[PDB]
Subunit: 312 residues, 5 copies
């Protein structure tokens, strides 16, 4: 049809709101995730105003191809949403109630610095492009911004779903455009990692540390190298989760520290054997008895320092 | 067209029913699964009533674009169903028989606490949204709620397919909506796990337990550590099935207990060697002869307790 | 348009036939497989009869939207076929020749009891639903049921493609429906398994069996346990083929028997060492010399019995 | 519209030609590969002939829905091509120039007998189906059969792209049909296999062969069995490339020969130890010194014979 | 409609420009990557010129089906772009402003010679095909060629986005066509490789090099062979990144050099043992003390030479 006449030469205000129904398929590698929710638009148009007393009907329904509908689009989506118009009602005063259901794929960056214990914010952007005849600005209606109680996501705890009412009215392509932001804060469940990744790793490391209570060179070599192979296999198991990041994560630092500890243990075993062969048993005994105590204290101190750096 | 006139000002009742034809692709990671079935709608409209004596035809078929059809949609689907209209017949009294075939992807939560022996319920939700002019409520017709005898699913035993007749008439978006629930209970087949996952694991553990019948330190170390590596490889084999859950499963608990047992066995071997070197052979012999009997009794007791906790 | 008038009040007969062009993508996990073939329909309609002498044309072509076409659908398909109408010709007497090309995905159960040497039958179901005005029954025309000589499938030998002429005229949804069955028998090529899976497994088992010709405990332990690890790795290699079945397959039974043999070998080695340490060398020598002969005879007998049970 | 009148009662000739733009995604497992190219059709129709002197225009463009276009389809494609009409021009004499762009997925068999050094021919089939009124035959225009210089395929060297001008005018479904064949010969690049698969395998085999220069039984057992495990792991690495074939390939034969060599080496080590224990050292020394020379000569001879059989 | 009349018989000039919004899914194996951006077309047509003084409107919007739009297509795309027309405005003088949003998949070759430290250029080609009536040439408008500040790509640092203004006006299919080139230079982030791939590899190699400080043959054999197995496992870990290339990469050369070093170390250990057994201990001691120093110097020199060759 056409934009409404400027009765007061004012920018047009539309009220929005998204009622989440379900979210799923949070792909961490591609940083994409899908939604399925509602969309309520409530603008005002005086050209559609009628008299309810004469007509005798409280609200009379028009056709989507019979009226004008402002274009509402998402920024960070691979393809356009699948719009399923559900209801349209026109109030006698002029306000038009609109509703629709859609599903789309959304792109949002993710931070994996504190991989086991991290909280992510998922952003959904709503943008309307002003036409030359009339200016249209966005708004947020708090009575429709919510989520369904059946919204479930595997491995995450949904905490809140709020929208920032302040729009960023920038200018792109010589046109003024508004933008709304919807934030969905989530938190990862870290229960299934303590008995799956952390504790077996510590058990293997402690098993490898038993070589300081022995004097047989072959047994020590077997212990240390076979535990190193087991460490590599467990890293193979763990590697199916971590994406590629340009910074240093917690898990990568821990794994590198474990590799360093294995190298130092091999060096110590070789030094002990070499001193024992060269007819200096007392020095080797002192070195191994001091290594026994020095290894785990240093391991605990390094873990404490890494935790104090990454988490504060 | 339009909703029928309120002849008695009563809510409109439609009778439903789904005849399953085939189900497949039960993805446990994403908790999605596809269907392909029928859909029977039988409502009443007096505006389409005709005289069969004058016309001479028992039932005369209309066109889907010539009548009104109430909108029936699913809640937990990624995309809209692929409707394939099959037949429409109008009875002289006013009842309209409708039929269609569809396929869709359904989301439903799954519980993996008792992973090898679990029963899941798959929910399909049917919702109709009332218009302002007329109120429409749902109903269940037991004569059409069934499944085809050729319905097959890999690894599961379909037990029943029933629909709860009671609808949850809540109010969403200032509109009254009804909801129907269809439940499909299934059970997992656990035959192919006893000789594939459980028994080889026990065999490897028993092989590792033979180190208590020997006194050679190198042989014991080789046995225990190589069996640990084999355990890690078998866990690699098993890991291609279990999803990520926020609670403790049966398999995870068993694997953690196995890791603990390996650690304790290594500790015992080291203690025996250290006592033997320090010129105390009798104490080492007593310790190993008591460990021989203590290990499997404790293993069986822990398994019994875990079974008694997870399954009752 | 409308069904033809009942000139004799007889059920309508249509002649079918599928000319396979290519089949591919036989997914064993999901038990789906795709086709691409023709479809010939030859029914009779007296309303389209014309005079060829007056018109002067042997056959005159109509439009698919100008005539009536009975609906032909598949039962076990995920989505509807992609119909590509190719030709339509109307004979003067009344017979109508119809032709089209399509591609679809078909679901059919598979039996994996004799996994290396198995023959499968792939079923394609054709169903027509009778209207209330006229009854339509199916038929098979043997002159069009065939396959193209270029039909190739990876790993399978296509043997035949026949259709059962007898239809199952059951009653579903208070309507009489007919059904046709097309069977495509195939056989798996088992050449690439003898030198890939079977023989290396036997070689590793025979290598592990050499521990009965030695008296060094450490060497025996190394041999047996390292061969067990190699067995687990080879099972990792093989596992990328077998689906999940509710019954006992041939390969699973063989693998379980191999695990049992490894366990018994470990037990025998431990017993020999324990008897040797306890100052009873003659008994240990007798036990090992009897085990040398007892192991392979028992292995061959068990293999023979499993083959006699699974294959007859 | 309709086929042109038989001015001379001659079969209609259309000139074809495909100008390749890009090819990609050569899936060896499914034997499918995608294209994107042009398609030039140049037939003759006297009904569209006009006078250029009177009109004053050299060529006047019609509409695709305003003229008749013969149907051109591919045989070995999963789905129909995505036709994008680009240009249509009608010459005054009657010849019609047609052009379009398309992309499709093509199925073609592949031969993997000489897997590292093989040349494959990719076939694209063009078929036109004659109507009852007029007969249409195909032809090849050499001025348009070519490939773009930017055509790139990962791992293959495109050599030629030619079309066989001779059509196979067979009869299918009681209709005469013509067929054209386009062949694209390619060759695999085998540089990245010599330092990736072949040489490390030889290095591991040579490492395992060092056991003939030693007399320690435990060291020999460790060497041979650990090298066997490394061989299995490297086969795991290599297995991600070879499809399933019903015949014997080069790589499979080489791997089987390697397994046989490992088995024979284990047998030789066991025999040497048994003879050494039984107080016959000279015989064991002679056997090992003869094995030292016999192993690599036999390996080289077997490799030469396999190469002479598979490649000539 | 039709091309504009040749007011001066000049080639038609259109001004282009792409404003990137987001890029993602850079598949290195298939060398494909997706985009989502804008597209501004600004051509001149005198037939749409109007009088703004008489009409009283600054710019009046037409319909996409009411005007002519030159066809703009991409060369290296699998499928056609999803055009979403956003705005069209006609200036009184005759210039027409056009805008649209699209998403597409683009193919571009990649160079993996310097895999960890490489810079790639991604090409997007724009082509317009001249009609016989009028000639259309392309142009670049620098005021619209840019990227959004939120453009993010995983693992890469976007540096610039420029378009070469010079078009390649070649002749294809007897028609003159222009082409524009858009280049997006990126660089890989190599932080997450130093502590993930390089350093553990060096640690394992250094661990294996400790065998020159020992005289026990069994311990040396265990060390070297087990470290070789760990090397193969780590290569398994690394192999999930490198595609297949017809030339020699940096990583492949390094891995081959590591394999060569392992082989030489095994040879040295065997030689030392053989000389020790044959009653020549001084020569073996000299050989091992010289190998101790010769191995790492040679390793460093080879690494320096490879770096000097691949990177200059
Ligand atoms: C070893 C004991 C580890 C205790 C860890 C406590 C962590 C804090 C905590 O319980 O947080 C609540 C959190 C809630 O779960 P979500 O991550 O939201 O799912 O609970 C957990 O993470 C519980 C973790 C307990 C681990 C159980 C390990 C038992 C085995 C111990 C054997 C002896 C060593
Ligand atoms: C350079 C890159 C890496 C090169 C390969 C490194 C392999 C591992 C090195 C092993 C070192 C072992 C040293 C050893 O056994 O000797 C101990 C030696 C003997 O002393 P004396 O009895 O007085 O002997 C002299 C009179 N006869 O004393 C020591 O402990 C020396 C200090 C050794 C520890 C430091 C080792 C550092 C290794 C390099 C790390 C690079 C990162
Ligand atoms: C070891 C014996 C294990 C017996 C387990 C019985 C479990 C109960 C049972 O049979 O349930 C019925 C159930 C039905 O199958 P679905 O899971 O529905 O497929 O049958 C089974 O699970 C049968 C399991 C039998 C395992 C056969 C193991 C034979 C090897 C034993 C060798 C000696 C140790
Ligand atoms: C702390 C984190 C883990 C640190 C690394 C742990 C590695 C494994 C520890 C191995 C302990 C071995 C103990 C050993 O060999 O000594 C046995 C020792 C010798 O006694 P005497 O003959 O009187 O000696 C004193 C007079 N000369 O006696 C014992 O058995 C002591 C008890 C040892 C068992 C308990 C070990 C607990 C290990 C920590 C578990 C953490 C979870
Ligand atoms: C070891 C010898 C094994 C002989 C097996 C014969 C099986 C029967 C047979 O040939 O069937 C025909 C069948 C046809 O192939 P499709 O499976 O249809 O493809 O041929 C085969 O399977 C041939 C199998 C021969 C295996 C060759 C093994 C050679 C290595 C032997 C080395 C010494 C041990
Ligand atoms: C129960 C669950 C499994 C528990 C852990 C099992 C680990 C493996 C068991 C190893 C048994 C080794 C037996 C051994 O070494 O002793 C041999 C012993 C010594 O006899 P004498 O010289 O008279 O000794 C008594 C006078 N001094 O004689 C034997 O051979 C006994 C029979 C042993 C074979 C049977 C073993 C069965 C093992 C359980 C299988 C469960 C399934
Ligand atoms: C070891 C030397 C192997 C030489 C192999 C020559 C093969 C023939 C040849 O060069 O063909 C040309 C061909 C062209 O490449 P495309 O396969 O088309 O890519 O080039 C190759 O394949 C070159 C192969 C050379 C391998 C380099 C190995 C260097 C390491 C040797 C270390 C000492 C052992
Ligand atoms: C049958 C299926 C496989 C069964 C399991 C096979 C395991 C491997 C077999 C190992 C054989 C080792 C033979 C051995 O050590 O004895 C050598 C023995 C001793 O001779 P004398 O000193 O005169 O002894 C007699 C007077 N005291 O002499 C030999 O070398 C015999 C020949 C052995 C080589 C042939 C082995 C063939 C093995 C079967 C291969 C099946 C394929
Ligand atoms: C070992 C020290 C290695 C120092 C490597 C410096 C490389 C140059 C550099 O910093 O480049 C900047 C670059 C920017 O990151 P992007 O690749 O763009 O992401 O930073 C890096 O790559 C930093 C690399 C530092 C590695 C840290 C290793 C710490 C462990 C050392 C333990 C002792 C051995
Ligand atoms: Cl959108
Ligand atoms: Cl729906
Ligand atoms: Cl269908
Ligand atoms: Cl096609
Ligand atoms: Cl395009």
């Amino acid at each position: 049809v056409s934009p409404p006449p400027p009765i007061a030469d004012e920018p047009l205000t539309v009220n929005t709101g998204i009622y989440l129904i379900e979210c799923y398929s949070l792909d961490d590698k591609a940083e994409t995730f899908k939604v399925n929710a509602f969309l309520s638009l409530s603008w005002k148009d005086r050209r559609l105003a009628f008299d309810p007393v004469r007509s005798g009907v409280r609200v009379k329904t028009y056709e989507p191809e019979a009226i004008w509908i402002p274009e509402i689009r998402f920024v960070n989506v691979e393809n356009a949403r699948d719009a399923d118009v559900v209801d349209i009602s026109v109030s006698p005063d002029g306000t038009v109630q609109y509703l629709e259901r859609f599903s789309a794929r959304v792109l949002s960056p993710l931070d994996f610095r504190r991989y086991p214990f991290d909280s992510q914010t998922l952003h959904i952007y709503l943008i309307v492009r002003s036409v030359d005849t009339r200016n249209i600005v966005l708004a947020v209606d708090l009575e429709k911004v919510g989520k369904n109680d059946d919204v479930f996501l595997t491995g995450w705890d949904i905490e809140s779903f709020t929208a920032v009412v302040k729009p960023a009215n920038f200018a792109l392509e010589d046109r003024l455009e508004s933008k709304l932001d919807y934030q969905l804060r989530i938190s990862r469940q870290y229960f299934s990692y303590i008995p799956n990744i952390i504790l077996p790793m510590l058990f293997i490391l402690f098993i490898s540390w038993t070589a300081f209570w022995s004097t047989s060179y072959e047994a020590n070599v077997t212990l240390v190298v076979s535990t190193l192979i087991a460490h590599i296999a467990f890293n193979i198991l763990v590697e199916t989760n971590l994406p590629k990041t340009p910074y240093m994560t917690y898990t990568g630092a821990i794994i590198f520290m474990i590799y360093l500890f294995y190298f130092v243990a091999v060096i110590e075993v070789t030094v002990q054997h070499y001193l024992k062969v060269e007819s200096q048993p007392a020095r080797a005994a002192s070195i191994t008895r001091a290594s026994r105590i020095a290894f785990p204290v240093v391991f605990l101190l390094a873990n404490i320092i890494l935790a104090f750096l990454f988490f504060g």
